[PDB]
Design an enzyme around this catalytic site. Structure first.
Site, PDB file in Angstrom:
ATOM      1  N   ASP A 207       0.797  -1.228   0.000  1.00 37.49           N
ATOM      2  CA  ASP A 207       0.000   0.000   0.000  1.00 37.49           C
ATOM      3  C   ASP A 207       0.839   1.294   0.000  1.00 37.49           C
ATOM      4  O   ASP A 207       0.392   2.312   0.542  1.00 37.49           O
ATOM      5  CB  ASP A 207      -0.998  -0.037   1.180  1.00 37.49           C
ATOM      6  CG  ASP A 207      -2.213   0.875   1.043  1.00 37.49           C
ATOM      7  OD1 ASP A 207      -2.565   1.227  -0.096  1.00 37.49           O
ATOM      8  OD2 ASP A 207      -2.864   1.157   2.072  1.00 37.49           O
TER       9      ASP A 207
ATOM     10  N   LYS B 281       1.914   4.627  -0.986  1.00 37.75           N
ATOM     11  CA  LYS B 281       1.310   5.806  -1.591  1.00 37.75           C
ATOM     12  C   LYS B 281       1.636   6.985  -0.677  1.00 37.75           C
ATOM     13  O   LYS B 281       1.882   6.788   0.517  1.00 37.75           O
ATOM     14  CB  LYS B 281      -0.217   5.625  -1.758  1.00 37.75           C
ATOM     15  CG  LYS B 281      -0.973   5.288  -0.492  1.00 37.75           C
ATOM     16  CD  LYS B 281      -2.439   4.994  -0.796  1.00 37.75           C
ATOM     17  CE  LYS B 281      -3.175   4.646   0.478  1.00 37.75           C
ATOM     18  NZ  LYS B 281      -4.639   4.519   0.290  1.00 37.75           N
TER      19      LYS B 281
ATOM     20  N   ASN C  64       0.075   7.381   2.879  1.00 37.19           N
ATOM     21  CA  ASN C  64       0.518   6.593   4.043  1.00 37.19           C
ATOM     22  C   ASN C  64       1.907   7.036   4.574  1.00 37.19           C
ATOM     23  O   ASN C  64       2.538   6.335   5.359  1.00 37.19           O
ATOM     24  CB  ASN C  64       0.503   5.106   3.697  1.00 37.19           C
ATOM     25  CG  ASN C  64      -0.865   4.529   3.477  1.00 37.19           C
ATOM     26  OD1 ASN C  64      -1.873   5.138   3.765  1.00 37.19           O
ATOM     27  ND2 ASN C  64      -0.921   3.292   3.019  1.00 37.19           N
TER      28      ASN C  64
END
Ligand SMILES: C[C@@H]1CC(=O)Nc2ncnc(N3CCC(c4nc(-c5ccc(F)c(C(F)(F)F)c5)cn4CCN4CCCC4)CC3)c21
Length: 326
Positions: free
Chosen positions: A134, A136, A139
């Site tokens: 995840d 990105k 984050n």
């Protein structure tokens, strides 16, 4: 008697974020005077939306990981209706807050952040056998010193040693690797694709692939050779093309040496990787917070709001108390 953590051991100061599954509040532990970001999750909204697998993956990864650039879990505890993550408070706010305002970062600034992300991902892969999936801008946060904090471990895949593969279709459409879209059986190299998208966003000021319609966006990820700014040097264009190779096998870091492939790239020349880890590298930006209650790098849409308070065998191994102080 073992230290028991409950909601009433915290003062609830500021709203940092709020959504469907719950809210994030800036808290202070009454006993120590220490500040944390408590993520409070409505047990019902997690159970109803089939996010139990994700929540437990998050708790497991958080309990099992310790790296300077991975957000640390201090305590995790539960009530009949709530799931509580007492997280290390990142005073620097979201990196998107900072990039959204600066438009672009200098090659030296993205160098510093990219090296910290590389350090954290090398650790998850090599040490913990975890694929993050995840990565990105969303984050990434900054601590009070200006060092990177990677957040949100729900999309992690555990038990991935060597060239081991995954099947799940997850991530943010805009950040999804080619191999993920082609619906293959992908490996750890998806994290290096993620690194390329974030470092492109950093040094360039925009996503390398964008279109409002999901179908068209995918085609750009799958086919378009990345466009670049005239100000951007060649080393950065190489790194970016390198991490943004459509074939994971071809991709920088897609090889058996994993992160070593990236660490050796010309853009990273001169950096001592043991020093990246050691926070021996001085941050290019120092958050200018006056105190821990200074929420200057947080969204006013949440901070200004007044705080108002809104089966069991499933969340078995959720509870945790850290062995570290502060
Ligand atoms: C706990 C977290 C991670 C950590 O370990 N330390 C820490 N330190 C300081 N601030 C932290 N927060 C600040 C609030 C932010 C946020 N969450 C939601 C939020 C939204 C929906 C939700 F369901 C939740 C929930 F998970 F809490 F339920 C939060 C909205 N916002 C702000 C809006 N941004 C999010 C991405 C785009 C802009 C997330 C990051 C953290």
């Amino acid at each position: 008697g073992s230290l028991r953590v409950t909601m009433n051991e915290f003062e609830y100061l500021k709203l940092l974020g709020k959504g469907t599954f719950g809210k994030v509040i800036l808290v202070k532990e009454k006993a120590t005077g220490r500040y944390y970001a408590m993520k409070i999750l409505k047990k019902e909204v997690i159970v109803a939306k089939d996010e139990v697998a994700h929540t437990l993956t998050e708790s497991r990864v958080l309990q099992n990981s310790r790296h300077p650039f991975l957000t640390a879990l201090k305590y995790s505890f539960q009530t009949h209706d709530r799931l509580c993550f007492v997280m290390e408070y990142a005073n620097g706010g979201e990196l998107f807050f900072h990039l959204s305002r600066e438009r672009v970062f200098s090659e030296d600034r993205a160098r510093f952040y990219g090296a910290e992300i590389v350090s954290a991902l090398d650790y998850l892969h090599s040490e913990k056998n975890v694929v993050y999936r995840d990565l990105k801008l969303e984050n990434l946060m900054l601590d009070k010193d200006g060092h990177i904090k990677i957040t949100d471990f729900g999309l992690c895949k555990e038990g991935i040693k060597d060239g081991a593969t995954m099947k799940t279709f997850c991530g943010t459409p805009e950040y999804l690797a080619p191999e993920v879209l082609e619906d293959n059986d992908y490996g750890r190299a998806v994290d290096w694709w993620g690194l390329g998208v974030v470092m492109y966003e950093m040094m360039c000021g925009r996503l390398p692939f964008y279109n409002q319609d999901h179908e068209k966006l995918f085609e750009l990820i799958l086919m378009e050779e990345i466009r670049f700014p005239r100000t951007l040097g060649p080393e950065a264009k190489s790194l970016l093309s390198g991490l943004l190779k459509k074939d994971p096998k071809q991709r920088l870091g897609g090889g058996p040496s994993d992160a070593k492939e990236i660490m050796q790239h010309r853009f990273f020349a001169g950096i001592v990787w043991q020093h990246v880890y050691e926070k021996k590298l001085s941050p290019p930006f120092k958050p200018q917070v006056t105190s821990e209650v200074d929420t200057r790098y947080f969204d006013e849409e949440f901070t200004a709001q007044m705080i108002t308070i809104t089966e069991q065998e499933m969340f078995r191994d959720f509870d945790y108390i850290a062995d570290w102080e502060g």
